[PDB]
Amino acid sequence: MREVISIHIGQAGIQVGNACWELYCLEHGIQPDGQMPDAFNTFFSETGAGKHVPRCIFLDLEPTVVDEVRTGTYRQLFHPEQLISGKEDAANNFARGHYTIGKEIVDLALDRIRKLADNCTGLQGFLVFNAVGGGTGSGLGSLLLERLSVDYGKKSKLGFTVYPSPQVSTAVVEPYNSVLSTHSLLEHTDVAVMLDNEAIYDICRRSLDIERPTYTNLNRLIAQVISSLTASLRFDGALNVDITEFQTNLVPYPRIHFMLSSYAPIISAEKAYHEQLSVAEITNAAFEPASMMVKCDPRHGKYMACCLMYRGDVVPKDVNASVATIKTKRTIQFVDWCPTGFKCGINYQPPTVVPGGDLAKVQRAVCMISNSTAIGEIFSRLDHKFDLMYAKRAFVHWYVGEGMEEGEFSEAREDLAALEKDFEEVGAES
Amino acid sequence: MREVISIHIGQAGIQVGNACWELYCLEHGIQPDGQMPDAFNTFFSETGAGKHVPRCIFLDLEPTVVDEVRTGTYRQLFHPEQLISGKEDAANNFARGHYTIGKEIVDLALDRIRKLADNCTGLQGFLVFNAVGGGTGSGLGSLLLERLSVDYGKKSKLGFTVYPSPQVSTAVVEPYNSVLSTHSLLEHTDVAVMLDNEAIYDICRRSLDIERPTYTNLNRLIAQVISSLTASLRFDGALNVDITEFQTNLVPYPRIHFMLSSYAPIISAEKAYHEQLSVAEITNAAFEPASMMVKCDPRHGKYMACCLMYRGDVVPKDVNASVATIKTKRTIQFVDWCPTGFKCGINYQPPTVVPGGDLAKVQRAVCMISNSTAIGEIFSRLDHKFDLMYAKRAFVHWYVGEGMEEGEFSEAREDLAALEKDFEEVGAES
Amino acid sequence: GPRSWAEDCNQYRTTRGSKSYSTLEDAGRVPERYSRTNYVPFLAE
Amino acid sequence: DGQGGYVARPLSGSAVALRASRVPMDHYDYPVGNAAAAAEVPPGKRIV
Amino acid sequence: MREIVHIQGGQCGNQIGAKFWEVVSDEHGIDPTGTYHGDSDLQLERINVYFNEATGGRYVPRAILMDLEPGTMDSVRSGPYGQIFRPDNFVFGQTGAGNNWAKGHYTEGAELIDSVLDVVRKEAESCDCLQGFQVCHSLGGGTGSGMGTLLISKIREEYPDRMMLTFSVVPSPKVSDTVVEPYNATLSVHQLVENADECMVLDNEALYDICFRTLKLTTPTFGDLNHLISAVMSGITCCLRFPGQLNADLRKLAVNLIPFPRLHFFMVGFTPLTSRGSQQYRALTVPELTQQMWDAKNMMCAADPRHGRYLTASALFRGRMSTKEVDEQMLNVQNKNSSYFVEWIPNNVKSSVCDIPPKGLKMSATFIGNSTAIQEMFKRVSEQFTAMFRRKAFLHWYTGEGMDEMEFTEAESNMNDLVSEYQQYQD
Amino acid sequence: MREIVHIQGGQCGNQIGAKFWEVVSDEHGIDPTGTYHGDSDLQLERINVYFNEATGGRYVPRAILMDLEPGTMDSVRSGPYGQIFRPDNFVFGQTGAGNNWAKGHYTEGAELIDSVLDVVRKEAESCDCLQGFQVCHSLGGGTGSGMGTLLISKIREEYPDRMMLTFSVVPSPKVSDTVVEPYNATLSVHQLVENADECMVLDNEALYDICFRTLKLTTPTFGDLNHLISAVMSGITCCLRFPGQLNADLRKLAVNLIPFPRLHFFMVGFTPLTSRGSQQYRALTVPELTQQMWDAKNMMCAADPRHGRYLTASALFRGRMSTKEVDEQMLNVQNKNSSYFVEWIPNNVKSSVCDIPPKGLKMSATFIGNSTAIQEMFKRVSEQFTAMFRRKAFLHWYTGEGMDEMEFTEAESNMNDLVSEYQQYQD
Numbered sequence A, B: 001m002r003e004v005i006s007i008h009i010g011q012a013g014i015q016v017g018n019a020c021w022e023l024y025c026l027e028h029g030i031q032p033d034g035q036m037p038d039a040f041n042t043f044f045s046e047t048g049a050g051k052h053v054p055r056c057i058f059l060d061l062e063p064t065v066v067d068e069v070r071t072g073t074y075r076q077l078f079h080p081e082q083l084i085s086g087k088e089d090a091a092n093n094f095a096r097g098h099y100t101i102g103k104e105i106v107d108l109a110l111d112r113i114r115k116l117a118d119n120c121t122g123l124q125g126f127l128v129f130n131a132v133g134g135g136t137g138s139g140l141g142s143l144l145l146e147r148l149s150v151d152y153g154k155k156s157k158l159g160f161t162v163y164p165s166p167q168v169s170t171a172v173v174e175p176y177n178s179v180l181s182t183h184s185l186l187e188h189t190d191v192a193v194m195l196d197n198e199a200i201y202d203i204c205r206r207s208l209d210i211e212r213p214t215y216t217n218l219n220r221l222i223a224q225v226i227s228s229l230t231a232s233l234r235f236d237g238a239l240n241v242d243i244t245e246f247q248t249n250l251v252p253y254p255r256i257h258f259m260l261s262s263y264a265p266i267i268s269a270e271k272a273y274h275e276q277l278s279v280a281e282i283t284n285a286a287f288e289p290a291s292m293m294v295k296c297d298p299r300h301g302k303y304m305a306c307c308l309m310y311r312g313d314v315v316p317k318d319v320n321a322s323v324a325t326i327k328t329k330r331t332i333q334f335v336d337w338c339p340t341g342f343k344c345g346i347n348y349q350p351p352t353v354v355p356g357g358d359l360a361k362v363q364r365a366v367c368m369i370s371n372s373t374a375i376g377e378i379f380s381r382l383d384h385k386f387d388l389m390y391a392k393r394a395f396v397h398w399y400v401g402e403g404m405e406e407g408e409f410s411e412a413r414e415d416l417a418a419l420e421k422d423f424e425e426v427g428a429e430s
Numbered sequence C: 001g002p003r004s005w006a007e008d009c010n011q012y013r014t015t016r017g018s019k020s021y022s023t024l025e026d027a028g029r030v031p032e033r034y035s036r037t038n039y040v041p042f043l044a045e
Numbered sequence D: 001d002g003q004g005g006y007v008a009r010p011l012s013g014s015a016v017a018l019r020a021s022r023v024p025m026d027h028y029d030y031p032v033g034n035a036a037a038a039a040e041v042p043p044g045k046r047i048v
Numbered sequence E, F: 001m002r003e004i005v006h007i008q009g010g011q012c013g014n015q016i017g018a019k020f021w022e023v024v025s026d027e028h029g030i031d032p033t034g035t036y037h038g039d040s041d042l043q044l045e046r047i048n049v050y051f052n053e054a055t056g057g058r059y060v061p062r063a064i065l066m067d068l069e070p071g072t073m074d075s076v077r078s079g080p081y082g083q084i085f086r087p088d089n090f091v092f093g094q095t096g097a098g099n100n101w102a103k104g105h106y107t108e109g110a111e112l113i114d115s116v117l118d119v120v121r122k123e124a125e126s127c128d129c130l131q132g133f134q135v136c137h138s139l140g141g142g143t144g145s146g147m148g149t150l151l152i153s154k155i156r157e158e159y160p161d162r163m164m165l166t167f168s169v170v171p172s173p174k175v176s177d178t179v180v181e182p183y184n185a186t187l188s189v190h191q192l193v194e195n196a197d198e199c200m201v202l203d204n205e206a207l208y209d210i211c212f213r214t215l216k217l218t219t220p221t222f223g224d225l226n227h228l229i230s231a232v233m234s235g236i237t238c239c240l241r242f243p244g245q246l247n248a249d250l251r252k253l254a255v256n257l258i259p260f261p262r263l264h265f266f267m268v269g270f271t272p273l274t275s276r277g278s279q280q281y282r283a284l285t286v287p288e289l290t291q292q293m294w295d296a297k298n299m300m301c302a303a304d305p306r307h308g309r310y311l312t313a314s315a316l317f318r319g320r321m322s323t324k325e326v327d328e329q330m331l332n333v334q335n336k337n338s339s340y341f342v343e344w345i346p347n348n349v350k351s352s353v354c355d356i357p358p359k360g361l362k363m364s365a366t367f368i369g370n371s372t373a374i375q376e377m378f379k380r381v382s383e384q385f386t387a388m389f390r391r392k393a394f395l396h397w398y399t400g401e402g403m404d405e406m407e408f409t410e411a412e413s414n415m416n417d418l419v420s421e422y423q424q425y426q427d
């Protein structure tokens, strides 16, 4: 049976995962206690008599964000030993979460993954949720993803990384911590989906017309992206797109595998009555620059590959019609060597709205995940952001003292410099 | 299917379109909420389940006139994001509405036009409602107009513009704004219908026999003019005339596209019962100079071309006979090189009447829209009006600092003079 | 003719198909033959 | 099933009507009259 | 077996063809729903001339409706008898010609002339032996003028041995309904002179005069004028559809009415038209039908026939009539005013009879005339053309798409050429 | 006594076959349960060709489903007419190809291709005589393409004298449904030439056009395409299942449509496709079926048949119709447009009639056409492959599983070898 293990490392992993499984219980009708009052086998395992436990781990060194799940509304849902805690956090240090504090907790992490792998019949992929700015999301995320490649080779890892914004940061050592994570992100992960907080900010401000939402509202509509990505496994549809299709369709070269995200209908409750939401309308809304999950302008780059996961009442005729309209306009630019750049996936279940959520009931949705050459601007900006502080070697005595050598910064800069060179020469016309 | 898209720029644009959309809802049975209790397609978008939203945009830099629409009785009619507001008005500055503060809002303005055009299936024209004397109607009016020509080439644009009167004006730099708005309105608009304020004041004083009307009473009968010409797209008729038919039938030369517009029966309630309304009487009253909605003498110039938007129970022969009697009338005069001079368009629906409006119900009506050489005296006065104030550089520092240079007033001066030379050389007998 | 698919396929045999060949029962009469002899044929043991 | 029974959920909660196909394929009892022609006509303008 | 394909273009041609199929289908007795519900066997004898047999007893017209805007499609379809046409034959555009001959014939007609030639070929190849193509359009608009004559240009080389009949209305002298009537006319008549095999000129103001002076209607509506056109159009093909004592198909009319290949413009008029008051007073007799037919005001064309000489006239009589009274009254009207006929053609007038009149009528007659007097309209539209072509007004629309002023002189040459031998044969 | 073994592969082939068994089973009158409820005595004569008699009157198809994900099997199993198949014929894998041609053919293909050929061996030995094999798959995918054409090569090696009907959809011109369509289509055609006997080319855009302009379906669902495809697949083998007046089995179409062995790509279209409303308007004769079958827009292929000559065409007429009326009408398409045919093959069109029509049809036909105009489709595939292969884009998934870059070169060499042969014979 089709089935995917989800892994949440770092605080941003736990808080998004608290909203992801909230959406997943509402898809399948699972109450928060853990009882249903056969699509659940993708994410839940039927334990004994009527008990469903998630196929997930909440690994975090900081105890306050993991026991908030333990003392929340989902105490009975999760198996208690999946929730792996620690004494002290990684404290925004890549050197800590990789070398001095993460080694004694990653062996506990591999045991639960091994037990979940034996409990699952045929495994299909790994979901890794982390933010590279934090120490736990980058240091412990690198350590867990490195061992999964050794333990389970050639098996796809579908990760979702929250990157720092061009303008807004909640930490100072995020440029240091993002670069070292990316050196471990090229070699081991298969498909990594780019996420950025500020591009979720102006989606909430403009489309959802709410002036001051919080991180609960960001992670709520992130789960709408995550669920529609994996909706093809749970429910039947006309054109199924599984995880193994994602690596072949979207990754042309082994080191270019970073993809943006988009969700087409972002409509508030009162906006739904006035606005008409057709397939041709939402496909244009999906390709709009303001609707993306990463603050980058697609006009600067070219779309090397695209993937459209549709949901709900979507006839295959007009998604064929809407794709033909996208090819005609000059604003959306493809790379010259990829004439066939669209994969379409049509499911047959509309997105589930949560009670008290800001999303309205929409019959049809698109989850656009597309490889682009404009993503090099995101990497180059962080590359220039990190190069400003390494020139004077600020904030290095903390990383050097926690195990790792200063030579790891030069190799991580060289690895991202190869990524800068890669996006230029691949995206250039020939 | 046939379609039309209306834009409304400035205080005069919104208040006219407030009266226009009030007229359009009564004709098609649209409730103020937007739900009827086939012909609505030209002005309304059928959204979801029985809700119709207008194909309009209400953009203005000043928020207090747009906010009246938001808090008024049509809060549920228009889409909420469809209405566009701004921070600070241009405030009678063509430099402000075109360069400094109009640039940040025109990028959002083209976004909604693109969404309305994409929802459209066959686009026939654009309706532009603005006053060239105001800062927003001239500045933001020109910037929105010039970008539409590049984005949508060879597409008709019906720009209904309210011009300042020789005797009546309420903003001091209206002659400054009218000349600068004229410099862009020639090469961009396809058909421009001149409107003047106090000729409507004279119509309401004489024909309506009411002594104290306000701009609400003016915009109601102006809405009847717009609804008369566009009624052949929505309703059938003996001689259906489209938006595309107006341009080649009323614009002989590429620069002469200014047209007068008159409504023939404009009769109060108790007057119409004693009045005998027939086609011969309204056709004579159509060409009657005091019924013209611009202060201009049709005897001074030559009627170059003319179209008649007959409505109601009009057979094709009493209009045939009335044209012959008008042709043999020695008071009017056509140009020598245009023997065939009449366009006849008959529709089968009598015009509606707004409850609480000054107009009474009539069986038949004529909208006389004509191209004349008499319109030169309107721009000859404005050329005299502008040259005297520019002779000692009055109110120039308000334009120089906000982007514009001194030479734009010089360059726009011969553009009116080349227009004045074109009118006098096209009415010259050969 | 036929008004339904079942009736068309059922009457295919008796109208235009393998059972359409004319039967002697459908023939009004058997023609009387001008045979050479109604006596014994000459070479017929 | 547990005893080898070849079990299969029909999955027909009247969703198979939407799943199905609508091609005419029928030269008998075709719709004759007014509404059959009027159904395929797009709405267009209205007539007074 | 000889049969007619009808092609209707423009707002005028679609509307007058809807009234044409209103009248003919009443004559052959088929209902609005297409089924036959008449009484006589002679109605069904020649139905293939205009209709196709369909399964289940339906009768569809052999009509192909074309236009560049969907508005005129809705008016024909929503009216009575507007359902009988095939839904595949309802080809239409979206933008519309907009009274522009350049848009109708070059830009917007190009991506739709292929679609109409896909279905005109389909209707022609499906049937047995084409007599010719009958079209109805207007010379003042752009939908039936530019796109209409583009089809006439295209269908001519596809079938160069078949008839062609253009029932086209021309602009009126007293009034104008579009301001670019001389541009639409002179460019369209330039196309019809080499392509159309024969043309029947109609005009609006003479239809108005007939409904006022003869029919005494106070307010003749928009559909009344089409019925006078449709009565003549049903009268041209009277010998195709019914038996007769002296038959005359549409090539007998062509070889008789056309002395020279460029003189294929005709003027037409329906004879027995009386007001409702004058029904109980007028005596329907062949001498009465003769003095109404040759009246100058009874012509549905704008030209006054007393100005010019008739080169050849035709009279397609319908009804049980003594043929000598048909024959003698033609000779009688030829010699009482012999100056108004032409001198170098012996036996100017042509008489044909059919034994089935229209319903209610005991006798009816359709007049087709090849008069010199139609040079008055052609010199008038040439007078209006040269007025505005010197000043180059209303011309940037026509040359804005890529049709320059080179053929405007060629169109003005042809209108001056066409009026030249009309005046030459007057002498 | 002539049997065809059906093998469905991939998402497209399984979903096409489910609607295909929706048509064939309903034609022979068997219910959803499995027993017989038909009202025609001609149905049960030839059930051997597509079914097997089981205990208690049950009928099971000769269908071997094949896929690498159980998800598409569940939709077929749950759906109506899905219980009729044999459970041991449901061979399937677990990992799924993920639109990789290497996974379907080389690495993961070997783990299932041993468990497929034994199952299809069981069906082939059970029946009496193999007329051929019928396989349905897609070329744009990797699950039904790589495993599909591997199955052809094995089954052609072990049964070398049997026919091979391959019904394959090709990548669409206007849009793309998966990103690696040029890589999979170039590799599949490279292996389908030397193995498959006759190949049928389908395209979704032509299905989307036929569902819109003929049937007037505003929302063509994903099974409307399959029903039109299944209308052909039931009509290819009509002579094997019903008595006929001029029989044509799979090998008659193999010998009359393949001039040279490599040129075995065809295109199909079902003839009497009408809208529901306009069925009353159109009549039903053999010439009207022939006019619809030779239209370029009635093809279910992406190619335009006007751009190339027809090498060989075959028509499979169905119903009560005259053989002269069939034969003289296929002469008219040889004479009306003789420039669109191959000059050096006299009698390009073969016609066969089987006088039992499909379910609910007066008359119908299936039109197979071997045209050289289909070189445009392969050139479209070839030009897309050359854009990606020089840049080595999307190749590390293929070359990471044993199929290195050398085999792509002979894949494109045979891709250009096929288009060279079509273009040469067009001259």
Ligand SMILES: Nc1nc2c(ncn2[C@@H]2O[C@H](COP(=O)(O)OP(=O)(O)OP(=O)(O)O)[C@@H](O)[C@H]2O)c(=O)[nH]1
Pocket: A009, A010, A011, A012, A013, A015, A016, A061, A062, A089, A090, A091, A092, A093, A130, A131, A132, A133, A134, A135, A136, A137, A138, A162, A164, A169, A170, A171, A197, A215, A216, A218, A219
């Ligand atoms: N969108 C979103 N981002 C979050 C959320 N919580 C944390 N983040 C991101 O996480 C980054 C901070 O690093 P974290 O991942 O929280 O830190 P950590 O990995 O837990 O490491 P420690 O804090 O030392 O335990 C910030 O840049 C935030 O953008 C959340 O709820 N939603």
Ligand SMILES: Nc1nc2c(ncn2[C@@H]2O[C@H](COP(=O)(O)OP(=O)(O)OP(=O)(O)O)[C@@H](O)[C@H]2O)c(=O)[nH]1
Pocket: B009, B010, B011, B012, B013, B015, B016, B061, B062, B089, B090, B091, B092, B093, B097, B130, B131, B132, B133, B134, B135, B136, B137, B162, B169, B170, B171, B197, B215, B216, B218, B219
């Ligand atoms: N017919 C008509 N004219 C109006 C109306 N409101 C304002 N006007 C005209 O507009 C002129 C004032 O200039 P506007 O164009 O309204 O200036 P504005 O639209 O407020 O633009 P800004 O001043 O830059 O905000 C007046 O002289 C009036 O003649 C109206 O409701 N109906």
Ligand SMILES: Nc1nc2c(ncn2[C@@H]2O[C@H](COP(=O)(O)OP(=O)(O)O)[C@@H](O)[C@H]2O)c(=O)[nH]1
Pocket: E009, E010, E011, E012, E013, E015, E016, E097, E098, E099, E138, E140, E141, E142, E143, E144, E145, E169, E171, E176, E177, E178, E203, E204, E207, E222, E225, E226, E229
């Ligand atoms: N007799 C008659 N003339 C008509 C009719 N409709 C329009 N016309 C004439 O046609 C001219 C306008 O043509 P138009 O509608 O623009 O033609 P189109 O552009 O081809 O559709 C006018 O001068 C009318 O007098 C009709 O129903 N009957």
Ligand SMILES: Nc1nc2c(ncn2[C@@H]2O[C@H](COP(=O)(O)OP(=O)(O)O)[C@@H](O)[C@H]2O)c(=O)[nH]1
Pocket: F009, F010, F011, F012, F013, F015, F016, F099, F138, F140, F141, F142, F143, F144, F145, F169, F171, F172, F177, F178, F204, F207, F222, F225, F226, F229
């Ligand atoms: N006509 C038709 N085409 C289909 C169907 N299912 C898939 N396709 C087409 O098959 C092509 C790719 O097939 P794919 O889904 O990759 O098959 P897979 O390899 O088994 O996953 C697409 O272009 C689809 O248009 C179907 O049921 N009917």
Ligand SMILES: [Mg+2]
Pocket: A010, A011, A062, A089, A134, A136
């Ligand atoms: Mg933390």
Ligand SMILES: [Mg+2]
Pocket: B010, B011, B060, B062, B089, B136
């Ligand atoms: Mg203002």
